[PDB]
């Protein structure tokens, strides 16, 4: 288990928690449904994202209809379970890079505001340069390398409904010395359509936990990016307005 270690006087400021949840580190797993689209037709929101300078921090963000599904369960007066999974997708295989399972979700509230969740899973080589956005549905990527270029797919599962968003990402060719190479295409983590179909993909077997709430994880990712020389885009600043 990854833990953050070091002197208190080197911490960033942490925004207050959004929702007090319990990580059920012992919950027993189900295989990952295939992210490939074949026999179940889906509408997909397709976005494009391009970094314009080396080591640029970027965010994969797109409004979805997730609330219209959550609030259908509210009108039914049903709590629900959910799953969030990010993939890097190629025609031959798909690599899950972030995966979370949610239980006892109150549909009066927003996505992710659920009493329980699984371990919060990440590709281990992304933990210091990646985190969720504030509503837990976006992905922040610090110091990408050129090899990050390609197709990213987010699958949100709410009860028995699924939402797909694709991001076509371009990163320029100059080298970023702050980056980590993810080797996204490695067959240990890049799983074929057949492997998903046969029910054989279990994220606990190859992703790693970073069981810190979003506000703490992103605060650290932004702090480490700047302390290593990165130029933080104003998009990732917080509002102080007139206060303090």
Author numbering: 34 to 277
From the reporting publication:
Of these, gD is the (main) receptor-binding protein that interacts with the cell receptors and triggers the subsequent fusion process with cell membrane and/or uptake by endocytosis. The cores consist of a nine-stranded (A′, B, C, C′, C″, D, E, F, and G) β-barrel, arranged in a typical V-like Ig fold, flanked by N- and C-terminal extensions with loops, α-helices (α1, α2, α3’, and α3), and small β-strands (str2-4).
In total 244 residues could be modeled (R34 to R277). The overall folds of gD1 and gD4 are very similar with a root-mean-square deviation (rmsd) of 0.7 Å for 220 common Cα atoms. Apparent dissociation constants ( Kdapp ) of 7,000 ± 2,000 nM and 5,800 ± 760 nM were calculated for gD1 and gD4, respectively. The truncated gD4 version, gD436-280, exhibited a receptor binding affinity to MHC-I in the same order of magnitude (6,700 ± 750 nM). That the C-terminal truncation had no significant effect on the receptor affinity of EHV-4 gD suggests that the mode of binding differs from other alphaherpesviruses, however, the role of the C-terminus remains to be determined. For EHV-4, the infection was reduced by an average of 32% after blocking the cells with soluble gD4 recombinant protein. gD4 was also able to block the entry of EHV-1 by 40%.
